[PDB]
Amino acid sequence: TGDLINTVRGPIPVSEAGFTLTHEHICGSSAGFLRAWPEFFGSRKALAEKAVRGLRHARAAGVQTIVDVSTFDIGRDVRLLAEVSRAADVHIVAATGLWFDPPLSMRMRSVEELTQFFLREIQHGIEDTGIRAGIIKVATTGKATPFQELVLKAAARASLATGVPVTTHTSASQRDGEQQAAIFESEGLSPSRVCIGHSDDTDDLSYLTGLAARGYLVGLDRMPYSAIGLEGDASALALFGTRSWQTRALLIKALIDRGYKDRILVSHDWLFGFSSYVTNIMDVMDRINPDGMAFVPLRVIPFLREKGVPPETLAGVTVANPARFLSPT
Ligand SMILES: CCOP(O)(=S)OCC
Ligand SMILES: [Co+2]
Ligand SMILES: [Fe+2]
Numbered sequence: 001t002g003d004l005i006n007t008v009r010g011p012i013p014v015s016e017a018g019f020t021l022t023h024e025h026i027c028g029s030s031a032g033f034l035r036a037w038p039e040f041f042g043s044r045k046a047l048a049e050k051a052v053r054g055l056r057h058a059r060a061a062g063v064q065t066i067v068d069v070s071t072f073d074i075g076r077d078v079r080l081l082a083e084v085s086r087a088a089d090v091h092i093v094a095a096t097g098l099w100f101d102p103p104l105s106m107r108m109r110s111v112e113e114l115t116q117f118f119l120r121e122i123q124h125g126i127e128d129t130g131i132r133a134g135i136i137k138v139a140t141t142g143k144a145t146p147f148q149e150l151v152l153k154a155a156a157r158a159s160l161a162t163g164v165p166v167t168t169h170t171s172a173s174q175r176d177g178e179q180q181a182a183i184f185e186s187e188g189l190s191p192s193r194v195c196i197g198h199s200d201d202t203d204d205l206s207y208l209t210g211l212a213a214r215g216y217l218v219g220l221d222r223m224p225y226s227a228i229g230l231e232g233d234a235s236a237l238a239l240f241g242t243r244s245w246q247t248r249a250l251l252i253k254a255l256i257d258r259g260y261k262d263r264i265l266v267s268h269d270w271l272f273g274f275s276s277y278v279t280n281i282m283d284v285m286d287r288i289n290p291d292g293m294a295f296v297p298l299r300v301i302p303f304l305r306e307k308g309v310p311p312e313t314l315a316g317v318t319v320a321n322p323a324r325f326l327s328p329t
Contacts, residue, residue: 001013001015003015003327003328005093005134005326005327005328006093006094006131006132006133006134007065007085007091007092007093007094007134008068008078008081008082008085008092008093008094008131009082009085009086009091009092011092012142014234014323014326015120015323016064016091016152017064017065017091017319017322017323017326018064018065018319019062019063019064019297019318019319020063020064020065020265020269020318020319020322020323020326021063021065021066021067021266021267021293021296022064022066022067022069022167022195022219022221022265022267022322022325022326023060023067023069023167023178023195023197023219023221023267023268023269023270024066024067024068024069024267024268024269024271025068025069025070025074025269025270025272026051026068026070026077026080026081026084026092026271026272026273027041027047027051027070027075027077027080027271027272027273027274027275028070028075028271028273028274028275028276028277029070029074029075029077029273029274029276030073030074030075030101030275030276031072031073031075031103032075033075033275034047034077034080035077037055037275040275041273043277044080044254045170046085047080047272047273048080048084048087048155050272050273051080051084051088051272051273052087052088054270054272054292054293055084055085055088055090055293056088056089056090057291057292057293057294058090058246058292058293058294058297059088059089059090059296060294061291061294061298062297063090063116063293063294063296063297064090064091065090065091065092065093065135065322066090066093066293067090067093067135067167067322067326068081068092068093068094068095068152069094069095069096069135069137069167069197070095070098070137071096071098071099071137071250072096072098072102072106072180073096073098073099073100073101073102073103073105073106073202074099074101074253074276075275075276076094076095076126077212078094078126078127078129078131079129081131082129082131082152082230084292089300093134093135093326094126094131094132094133094134094135095133095134095135095136095167096117096118096121096122096133096135096136096137096158097118097124097135097136097137097138097151097155097166098114098137098138098139098151099137099138099139099169100140100148100169101276101289102147102151103324107147109150109164110150111150111153111157112154112156114150114151114154115154115158116155117154117156118133118136118154118155119158119162119283122134122136122158122162122164123162125271126241131139133164133249134164134326135164135165135166135167135169135303135326136155136158136159136164136165136166137169138151138152138155138165138167138168138169139151139164139168139169139170139176140168140169140170140171140176140179140180141169141170141171141176142171142174142176143174143176143179144176144179144180144183149183152180152183152216153173153183153186153187155184156183156184156187156188156208157187159189159193160187160188160189162328163193163327163328163329164328165193165194165325165326165329166184166189166193166194166195167194167195167197167219168180168194168195168196168197168219169197169198170196170197170198170199170201171198171201172198172199172200172201172202172204172207173201173202173204174248175202175204175207176196177196177199177207177211177216178207178211180194180196180198181211181214181216183193187192190215190329191211191214191215191216192215192216192217192324192329193329194216194217195216195217195218195219195265195325196211196216196217196218196219196271197219197221198219198221198222199211199218199219199220199221199251200219200220200221200222200223200248200251202239203221203243203247203251204313205251205254205258207253208251208255208321209258209260212255212258212260212263213260215263217262217263217264217265217321217325218255218260218264218265219265219267220248220251220252220255220264220265220266220267221266221267221268221269222248222267222268222269223245223248223249223263223266223267223268223295223296223299223300224245224268224270224289224291224295224299225239225240225241225245225248225269226240226241226242226244226245226289227239227240227242227288227289228240228242228243228244229288230284230288233284235278235281236281237275239277239281240288245295245299245300246303249300249303249304252264252266252300252304252309252317253304253307253309256309256313256317260311261316262320262321262324263321264317264318264321265321265322265325266296266300266318267296268289268292268293268295268296270289270293270295271285271293272292296318297318301314301318
Protein backbone atom coordinates (compact mmCIF):
# COMPACT_ATOMS: atom_id res chain seq x y z
CA THR A 1 0.00 0.00 0.00
CA GLY A 2 1.11 3.63 -0.54
CA ASP A 3 2.91 3.16 -3.90
CA LEU A 4 1.13 5.19 -6.62
CA ILE A 5 0.94 5.07 -10.37
CA ASN A 6 -0.18 7.91 -12.62
CA THR A 7 -3.24 7.30 -14.82
CA VAL A 8 -5.10 9.54 -17.24
CA ARG A 9 -7.61 10.26 -14.43
CA GLY A 10 -4.85 10.98 -11.90
CA PRO A 11 -2.96 8.95 -9.27
CA ILE A 12 -4.15 5.49 -8.11
CA PRO A 13 -2.76 3.09 -5.55
CA VAL A 14 -0.61 0.39 -7.28
CA SER A 15 -2.71 -2.24 -5.41
CA GLU A 16 -5.79 -1.04 -7.26
CA ALA A 17 -4.35 -1.66 -10.77
CA GLY A 18 -5.51 -5.30 -10.46
CA PHE A 19 -5.57 -7.31 -13.71
CA THR A 20 -3.49 -5.14 -16.05
CA LEU A 21 -2.84 -5.40 -19.80
CA THR A 22 0.55 -3.76 -20.20
CA HIS A 23 0.72 -3.16 -24.01
CA GLU A 24 -2.43 -1.81 -25.62
CA HIS A 25 -3.70 1.22 -27.63
CA ILE A 26 -6.98 3.08 -27.70
CA CYS A 27 -6.06 4.27 -31.21
CA GLY A 28 -2.87 3.65 -33.30
CA SER A 29 -2.44 6.89 -35.35
CA SER A 30 0.05 9.72 -35.83
CA ALA A 31 0.70 13.03 -34.06
CA GLY A 32 -2.03 15.58 -34.91
CA PHE A 33 -3.95 13.14 -37.10
CA LEU A 34 -7.08 12.64 -34.94
CA ARG A 35 -7.40 16.46 -34.64
CA ALA A 36 -6.90 17.08 -38.42
CA TRP A 37 -8.89 14.20 -39.82
CA PRO A 38 -11.30 12.67 -37.30
CA GLU A 39 -13.65 11.57 -40.13
CA PHE A 40 -10.99 8.99 -41.03
CA PHE A 41 -12.38 7.08 -37.97
CA GLY A 42 -15.98 7.85 -38.84
CA SER A 43 -15.82 10.53 -36.21
CA ARG A 44 -14.10 11.17 -32.90
CA LYS A 45 -17.43 10.40 -31.12
CA ALA A 46 -17.67 7.07 -33.03
CA LEU A 47 -14.07 6.18 -32.06
CA ALA A 48 -14.63 7.00 -28.38
CA GLU A 49 -17.91 4.97 -28.26
CA LYS A 50 -16.23 1.93 -29.89
CA ALA A 51 -13.35 2.23 -27.41
CA VAL A 52 -15.77 2.54 -24.43
CA ARG A 53 -17.69 -0.63 -25.53
CA GLY A 54 -14.40 -2.55 -25.96
CA LEU A 55 -13.02 -1.52 -22.56
CA ARG A 56 -16.33 -2.31 -20.82
CA HIS A 57 -16.10 -5.77 -22.43
CA ALA A 58 -12.54 -6.14 -21.11
CA ARG A 59 -13.76 -4.90 -17.70
CA ALA A 60 -16.62 -7.49 -17.60
CA ALA A 61 -13.87 -10.12 -18.28
CA GLY A 62 -11.83 -8.96 -15.25
CA VAL A 63 -9.46 -6.39 -16.83
CA GLN A 64 -9.05 -3.43 -14.42
CA THR A 65 -6.15 -1.44 -16.02
CA ILE A 66 -4.58 -1.10 -19.44
CA VAL A 67 -1.27 0.63 -20.25
CA ASP A 68 -1.81 2.56 -23.48
CA VAL A 69 1.74 2.58 -24.92
CA SER A 70 0.87 5.11 -27.67
CA THR A 71 3.60 7.77 -27.80
CA PHE A 72 3.55 11.25 -29.30
CA ASP A 73 4.21 9.72 -32.77
CA ILE A 74 1.47 7.09 -32.42
CA GLY A 75 -0.80 10.18 -32.16
CA ARG A 76 -1.59 9.51 -28.45
CA ASP A 77 -4.55 11.77 -27.53
CA VAL A 78 -4.54 11.87 -23.76
CA ARG A 79 -7.92 13.73 -23.56
CA LEU A 80 -9.44 10.87 -25.55
CA LEU A 81 -7.87 8.32 -23.14
CA ALA A 82 -9.24 10.18 -20.11
CA GLU A 83 -12.74 10.36 -21.61
CA VAL A 84 -12.92 6.64 -22.47
CA SER A 85 -11.29 5.60 -19.15
CA ARG A 86 -13.95 7.54 -17.23
CA ALA A 87 -16.80 6.21 -19.31
CA ALA A 88 -15.69 2.57 -19.18
CA ASP A 89 -14.40 2.62 -15.61
CA VAL A 90 -11.08 1.06 -16.62
CA HIS A 91 -7.75 2.68 -15.54
CA ILE A 92 -5.50 3.80 -18.41
CA VAL A 93 -1.77 4.53 -17.88
CA ALA A 94 -0.43 6.84 -20.60
CA ALA A 95 3.05 6.73 -22.16
CA THR A 96 5.82 9.04 -23.13
CA GLY A 97 8.79 8.08 -25.36
CA LEU A 98 8.96 7.63 -29.13
CA TRP A 99 7.94 4.76 -31.47
CA PHE A 100 9.35 4.33 -35.00
CA ASP A 101 7.55 7.21 -36.75
CA PRO A 102 9.17 10.31 -35.16
CA PRO A 103 8.78 13.54 -37.26
CA LEU A 104 11.87 15.69 -38.00
CA SER A 105 11.22 17.94 -34.99
CA MET A 106 12.02 14.84 -32.85
CA ARG A 107 14.64 13.23 -35.15
CA MET A 108 16.80 16.39 -34.95
CA ARG A 109 17.00 16.28 -31.14
CA SER A 110 19.93 15.34 -28.92
CA VAL A 111 19.87 12.74 -26.09
CA GLU A 112 19.67 15.63 -23.63
CA GLU A 113 16.70 17.26 -25.43
CA LEU A 114 14.84 13.91 -25.68
CA THR A 115 15.44 13.37 -21.96
CA GLN A 116 13.92 16.75 -21.30
CA PHE A 117 10.87 15.89 -23.43
CA PHE A 118 10.26 12.50 -21.73
CA LEU A 119 10.70 14.16 -18.28
CA ARG A 120 8.16 16.91 -19.16
CA GLU A 121 5.51 14.27 -19.97
CA ILE A 122 6.29 12.25 -16.74
CA GLN A 123 6.85 15.11 -14.27
CA HIS A 124 4.89 18.11 -15.62
CA GLY A 125 2.15 16.68 -17.83
CA ILE A 126 1.35 15.86 -21.45
CA GLU A 127 0.54 18.89 -23.62
CA ASP A 128 -1.39 21.35 -21.45
CA THR A 129 -3.47 18.69 -19.65
CA GLY A 130 -1.55 17.96 -16.44
CA ILE A 131 -1.90 14.21 -17.17
CA ARG A 132 1.38 12.47 -16.41
CA ALA A 133 2.90 9.50 -18.28
CA GLY A 134 3.44 6.33 -16.20
CA ILE A 135 5.64 4.47 -18.70
CA ILE A 136 8.24 5.25 -21.39
CA LYS A 137 7.75 3.49 -24.80
CA VAL A 138 10.73 3.09 -27.32
CA ALA A 139 11.17 1.08 -30.53
CA THR A 140 13.68 -0.50 -32.89
CA THR A 141 12.91 -2.53 -36.00
CA GLY A 142 16.26 -4.32 -36.45
CA LYS A 143 19.50 -2.76 -35.43
CA ALA A 144 18.87 0.67 -33.84
CA THR A 145 19.13 3.67 -36.14
CA PRO A 146 21.45 6.35 -34.75
CA PHE A 147 18.43 8.36 -33.62
CA GLN A 148 16.91 5.26 -31.91
CA GLU A 149 20.18 4.91 -29.88
CA LEU A 150 19.54 8.38 -28.48
CA VAL A 151 15.90 7.61 -27.76
CA LEU A 152 16.86 4.47 -25.80
CA LYS A 153 19.50 6.35 -23.82
CA ALA A 154 17.10 9.22 -23.14
CA ALA A 155 14.51 6.64 -21.99
CA ALA A 156 17.08 5.11 -19.57
CA ARG A 157 17.90 8.53 -18.18
CA ALA A 158 14.30 9.57 -17.70
CA SER A 159 13.54 6.21 -16.03
CA LEU A 160 16.53 6.59 -13.68
CA ALA A 161 15.30 10.09 -12.72
CA THR A 162 11.62 9.17 -12.15
CA GLY A 163 11.45 5.37 -11.42
CA VAL A 164 8.91 4.91 -14.23
CA PRO A 165 9.50 1.76 -16.29
CA VAL A 166 10.56 1.42 -19.97
CA THR A 167 8.81 -0.81 -22.53
CA THR A 168 9.91 -1.60 -26.08
CA HIS A 169 8.76 -2.48 -29.60
CA THR A 170 11.17 -4.97 -31.25
CA SER A 171 11.39 -6.93 -34.42
CA ALA A 172 11.46 -10.13 -32.31
CA SER A 173 12.73 -12.36 -35.21
CA GLN A 174 15.79 -10.09 -35.46
CA ARG A 175 16.39 -10.36 -31.71
CA ASP A 176 16.44 -6.56 -31.06
CA GLY A 177 16.10 -6.97 -27.28
CA GLU A 178 19.78 -7.95 -26.99
CA GLN A 179 21.03 -4.61 -28.37
CA GLN A 180 18.25 -2.76 -26.56
CA ALA A 181 19.46 -4.46 -23.28
CA ALA A 182 23.09 -3.51 -24.10
CA ILE A 183 22.16 0.17 -24.61
CA PHE A 184 19.97 0.35 -21.44
CA GLU A 185 22.71 -1.28 -19.35
CA SER A 186 25.33 1.10 -20.78
CA GLU A 187 23.21 3.83 -19.09
CA GLY A 188 23.04 1.93 -15.76
CA LEU A 189 19.32 1.13 -16.00
CA SER A 190 18.15 -1.94 -14.10
CA PRO A 191 16.71 -4.78 -16.33
CA SER A 192 13.75 -5.00 -13.92
CA ARG A 193 12.70 -1.50 -15.11
CA VAL A 194 12.52 -2.78 -18.70
CA CYS A 195 10.03 -4.84 -20.74
CA ILE A 196 11.23 -6.17 -24.10
CA GLY A 197 7.99 -6.22 -26.06
CA HIS A 198 6.57 -8.18 -29.04
CA SER A 199 8.55 -11.10 -27.66
CA ASP A 200 5.75 -13.52 -28.60
CA ASP A 201 6.44 -12.71 -32.30
CA THR A 202 9.21 -15.35 -32.01
CA ASP A 203 9.46 -18.92 -30.64
CA ASP A 204 13.19 -18.48 -29.99
CA LEU A 205 13.33 -19.39 -26.29
CA SER A 206 17.16 -19.08 -26.24
CA TYR A 207 16.75 -15.36 -26.98
CA LEU A 208 13.78 -15.03 -24.52
CA THR A 209 15.27 -16.92 -21.60
CA GLY A 210 18.56 -15.10 -22.13
CA LEU A 211 16.76 -11.80 -21.47
CA ALA A 212 14.62 -13.23 -18.62
CA ALA A 213 17.77 -14.67 -16.86
CA ARG A 214 19.23 -11.10 -16.90
CA GLY A 215 16.12 -9.76 -15.13
CA TYR A 216 14.23 -8.25 -18.08
CA LEU A 217 10.45 -8.47 -18.34
CA VAL A 218 9.44 -10.32 -21.49
CA GLY A 219 6.41 -8.80 -23.14
CA LEU A 220 4.23 -11.49 -24.67
CA ASP A 221 1.89 -8.86 -25.96
CA ARG A 222 0.32 -9.77 -29.33
CA MET A 223 -1.81 -12.72 -28.13
CA PRO A 224 -4.79 -12.49 -30.59
CA TYR A 225 -2.64 -11.79 -33.67
CA SER A 226 -3.04 -14.55 -36.21
CA ALA A 227 -3.54 -14.31 -40.03
CA ILE A 228 -4.42 -18.02 -40.33
CA GLY A 229 -7.34 -18.01 -42.78
CA LEU A 230 -6.30 -14.68 -44.40
CA GLU A 231 -3.53 -15.66 -46.83
CA GLY A 232 -5.48 -13.83 -49.56
CA ASP A 233 -4.65 -10.56 -47.77
CA ALA A 234 -1.05 -9.40 -47.99
CA SER A 235 -1.31 -6.60 -45.42
CA ALA A 236 -3.29 -8.78 -42.95
CA LEU A 237 -0.56 -11.44 -43.33
CA ALA A 238 2.40 -9.10 -42.72
CA LEU A 239 0.63 -7.75 -39.60
CA PHE A 240 -0.87 -10.90 -38.03
CA GLY A 241 1.84 -13.46 -39.06
CA THR A 242 1.15 -17.21 -39.49
CA ARG A 243 1.36 -18.53 -35.87
CA SER A 244 -1.85 -19.34 -33.92
CA TRP A 245 -2.76 -17.60 -30.64
CA GLN A 246 -2.29 -21.01 -28.97
CA THR A 247 1.36 -21.00 -30.23
CA ARG A 248 1.82 -17.51 -28.74
CA ALA A 249 0.14 -18.53 -25.44
CA LEU A 250 2.37 -21.64 -25.19
CA LEU A 251 5.32 -19.21 -24.71
CA ILE A 252 3.77 -17.98 -21.46
CA LYS A 253 3.66 -21.62 -20.24
CA ALA A 254 7.18 -22.27 -21.61
CA LEU A 255 8.68 -19.41 -19.62
CA ILE A 256 6.76 -20.39 -16.47
CA ASP A 257 8.05 -24.04 -16.89
CA ARG A 258 11.64 -22.62 -17.06
CA GLY A 259 11.30 -20.75 -13.76
CA TYR A 260 10.53 -17.33 -15.27
CA LYS A 261 6.95 -16.77 -14.06
CA ASP A 262 7.88 -13.37 -12.47
CA ARG A 263 9.50 -12.08 -15.76
CA ILE A 264 6.39 -12.32 -17.91
CA LEU A 265 3.95 -9.65 -19.04
CA VAL A 266 0.92 -10.55 -21.18
CA SER A 267 -1.15 -8.31 -23.45
CA HIS A 268 -2.86 -8.00 -26.88
CA ASP A 269 -1.51 -4.88 -28.56
CA TRP A 270 -5.10 -4.30 -29.52
CA LEU A 271 -6.70 -1.01 -30.65
CA PHE A 272 -10.08 0.51 -31.50
CA GLY A 273 -8.79 2.60 -34.40
CA PHE A 274 -5.75 2.17 -36.58
CA SER A 275 -4.82 4.89 -39.08
CA SER A 276 -1.05 4.15 -39.30
CA TYR A 277 -1.83 1.00 -41.33
CA VAL A 278 -3.95 0.06 -44.38
CA THR A 279 -7.49 1.37 -44.77
CA ASN A 280 -10.26 -0.85 -43.21
CA ILE A 281 -7.65 -2.90 -41.29
CA MET A 282 -9.91 -2.44 -38.18
CA ASP A 283 -12.67 -4.51 -39.87
CA VAL A 284 -10.20 -7.37 -40.50
CA MET A 285 -9.00 -7.23 -36.86
CA ASP A 286 -12.48 -7.18 -35.40
CA ARG A 287 -13.43 -10.27 -37.48
CA ILE A 288 -10.33 -12.16 -36.29
CA ASN A 289 -10.86 -11.11 -32.62
CA PRO A 290 -14.32 -9.80 -31.80
CA ASP A 291 -13.42 -10.09 -28.09
CA GLY A 292 -10.83 -7.26 -28.42
CA MET A 293 -9.07 -6.72 -25.04
CA ALA A 294 -11.19 -9.45 -23.38
CA PHE A 295 -9.35 -12.07 -25.45
CA VAL A 296 -6.62 -12.66 -22.83
CA PRO A 297 -8.92 -13.32 -19.83
CA LEU A 298 -11.53 -15.18 -21.97
CA ARG A 299 -9.27 -17.41 -24.05
CA VAL A 300 -5.61 -17.29 -23.00
CA ILE A 301 -5.94 -17.61 -19.25
CA PRO A 302 -8.33 -20.63 -19.35
CA PHE A 303 -6.12 -22.23 -22.00
CA LEU A 304 -3.17 -21.93 -19.54
CA ARG A 305 -5.27 -23.13 -16.64
CA GLU A 306 -6.32 -26.20 -18.66
CA LYS A 307 -2.67 -26.89 -19.44
CA GLY A 308 -2.17 -27.01 -15.65
CA VAL A 309 -0.82 -23.53 -14.81
CA PRO A 310 -1.96 -22.93 -11.23
CA PRO A 311 -4.31 -20.02 -10.55
CA GLU A 312 -1.83 -18.33 -8.18
CA THR A 313 0.70 -18.34 -11.03
CA LEU A 314 -1.78 -16.82 -13.44
CA ALA A 315 -2.61 -14.14 -10.86
CA GLY A 316 1.10 -13.44 -10.35
CA VAL A 317 1.55 -12.93 -14.13
CA THR A 318 -1.50 -10.69 -14.72
CA VAL A 319 -1.57 -8.75 -11.42
CA ALA A 320 1.66 -8.99 -9.39
CA ASN A 321 4.07 -8.61 -12.36
CA PRO A 322 2.38 -5.45 -13.78
CA ALA A 323 2.13 -3.92 -10.27
CA ARG A 324 5.84 -4.46 -9.68
CA PHE A 325 6.74 -3.20 -13.20
CA LEU A 326 4.59 -0.01 -12.97
CA SER A 327 5.42 1.02 -9.36
CA PRO A 328 8.05 3.75 -9.66
CA THR A 329 11.24 2.16 -8.41
C1 LIG B 1 -0.01 -4.36 -34.48
C2 LIG B 1 0.24 -2.99 -33.89
O1 LIG B 1 1.66 -2.71 -33.95
P1 LIG B 1 2.31 -1.66 -32.95
O2 LIG B 1 2.43 -2.14 -31.43
S1 LIG B 1 4.09 -1.40 -33.37
O3 LIG B 1 1.39 -0.41 -32.99
C3 LIG B 1 0.77 0.23 -34.10
C4 LIG B 1 -0.09 1.29 -33.42
CO1 LIG C 1 4.95 -2.21 -31.47
FE1 LIG D 1 1.74 -1.43 -29.79
